[PDB]
Write a protein that binds this DNA or RNA. Sequence first.
DNA 1: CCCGGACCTGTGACAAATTGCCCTCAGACGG
DNA 2: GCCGTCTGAGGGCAATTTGTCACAGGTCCGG
Length: 212
Amino acid sequence: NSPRIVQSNDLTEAAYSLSRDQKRMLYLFVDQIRKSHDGICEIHVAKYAEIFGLTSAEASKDIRQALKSFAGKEVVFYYESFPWFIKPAHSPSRGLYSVHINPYLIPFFINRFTQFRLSETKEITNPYAMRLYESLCQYRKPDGSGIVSLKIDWIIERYQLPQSYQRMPDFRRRFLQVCVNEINSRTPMRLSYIEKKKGRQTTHIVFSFRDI
DNA sequence: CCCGGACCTGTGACAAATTGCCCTCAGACGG
DNA sequence: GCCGTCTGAGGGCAATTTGTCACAGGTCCGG
Ligand SMILES: [Mg+2]
Ligand SMILES: [Mg+2]
Ligand SMILES: [Mg+2]
Ligand SMILES: [Mg+2]
């Protein structure tokens, strides 16, 4: 009975770089906006702690540092670039934060759409594994299975992977294998994949999955 | 031919970053 | 009105994970 996140495919497939803590906050903003026109959201420390099973102290640390790391962050929809925030965050009351999302982002948030319950993702740690799990949901069938081929260059561009993952053996070891292992251990999805080649170069990854 | 060279793979090392933990002390509130 | 408790805003930590690069070791091309 946990919150059902839905988002436009354009966000699933946008180019940006966010941490886990920021992505966690981002799911609730999308939830708040959708339940309504101006872009102003709010986060309560004690509620965040209860959702993600943290203490109040570590929640406060997570929100505060996440919040100041949004500055200068930009989002690209393929292209068009936007800042996420147009005013610094601020706290009117103790245990409470108020934030100002770029109102021009509203239409990008909200029948080409992606949807998942928040409990599916709340134990994932690596933000790239959150990105991969969202793109797979975009292709999921009602029953819970799907199959899709993602191109390696597009993965690198959209998820803004760091430069050393342009060497394929590092791509495998520190991104692909790790995020496939997390999904299989931390979500209800059971995931497999295979590599597509052209000559000596590996060009796509083909993902298949079913539901537990 | 065999060479040096341009590709590809995986692993061992080390540097940089993130994780859940731990401790202090004042704010807000109610009994 | 004061004070005890529930909060959360600060300061830190060591153990793991993520990001980078050298080197070993495969193939095929062409002079
Ligand atoms: Mg933290
Ligand atoms: Mg080649
Ligand atoms: Mg040997
Ligand atoms: Mg050699």
